[PDB]
């Protein structure tokens, strides 16, 4: 349940970045940009965290 909840939160964040990039690209109306992107599409236990992890003391 909670894992799907975290998955949905991550999905919201990723959709935010994707839609930002989508609007930025949709503003661009130059034909050279669209031609180049068309050519491109057609081409294709841990030490640390807890306490002092070192040689002298742990």
């Amino acid at each position: 349940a909670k894992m799907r909840r975290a998955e949905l939160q991550r999905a919201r964040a990723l959709q935010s970045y994707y839609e930002a990039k989508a609007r930025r690209e949709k503003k661009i109306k130059s034909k050279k940009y669209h031609k180049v992107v068309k050519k491109g599409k057609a081409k294709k236990t841990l030490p640390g965290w807890g306490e002092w992890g070192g040689v002298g003391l742990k």
Partner: peptide, 19 residues
């Protein structure tokens, strides 16, 4: 020679009396 897509070329802005 014909320049390629990588070559930077900007689209031009179009702006008597009868008696």
């Amino acid at each position: 020679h014909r320049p390629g897509p990588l070559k930077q070329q900007n689209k031009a802005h179009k702006g008597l009396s009868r008696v």
